[PDB]
Amino acid sequence: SGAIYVGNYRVVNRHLATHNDWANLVWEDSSRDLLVSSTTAQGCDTIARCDCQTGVYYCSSRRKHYPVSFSKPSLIFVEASEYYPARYQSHLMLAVGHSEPGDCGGILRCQHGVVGIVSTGGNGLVGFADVRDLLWLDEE
Ligand SMILES: O=S(=O)(NC1CCCC1)C1CCOCC1
Numbered sequence: 001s002g003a004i005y006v007g008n009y010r011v012v013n014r015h016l017a018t019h020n021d022w023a024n025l026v027w028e029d030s031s032r033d034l035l036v037s038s039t040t041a042q043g044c045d046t047i048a049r050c051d052c053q054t055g056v057y058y059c060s061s062r063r064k065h066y067p068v069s070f071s072k073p074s075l076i077f078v079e080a081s082e083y084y085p086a087r088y089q090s091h092l093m094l095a096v097g098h099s100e101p102g103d104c105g106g107i108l109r110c111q112h113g114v115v116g117i118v119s120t121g122g123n124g125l126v127g128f129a130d131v132r133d134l135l136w137l138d139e140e
């Protein structure tokens with residue numbers, strides 16, 4: 001589990017969105033595994049605006065933050081999972097590292113702020129859903 005809280009937005013994995021998220025929907029994209037809902041309180045997070053390929057992510061199934069190198073956001077044919085079938089997922093970044101389903105929502109951060117959240121795992125890789133292209137999160 002986990003979310004990003006930027007302004008009056010809450011960014012979560014689409015597959016973990018709650019009824020309250022869907023009842024307060026701003027934007028959602030199944031291909032990216034992302035959903036954004038509206039919040040009453042302002043959040044603590046800054047979104048990275050950059051093309052970094054190094055950062056640190058939180059792995060709940062290790063209670064640890066790991067430094068990683070990761071690929072630029074791409075279309076990755078992802079095998080079906082505990083929460084999704086085998087399919088292509090867009091705006092996905094991969095690193096070598098540990099990821100189980102409940103690790104979804106862990107933040108990946110670089111020197112500029114939050115890059116994305118854990119979205120996929122398996123075969124010794126972790127995938128992160130990028131948010132750095134969602135420029136509208138920074139306003140309104
Ligand atoms: O091993 S995967 O399932 N698929 C391969 C990844 C690159 C090309 C296909 C990978 C999907 C993202 O999360 C980590 C697992």
Ligand SMILES: [Zn+2]
Pocket residue numbers: 048049050051052110111112113
């Ligand atoms: Zn950066």
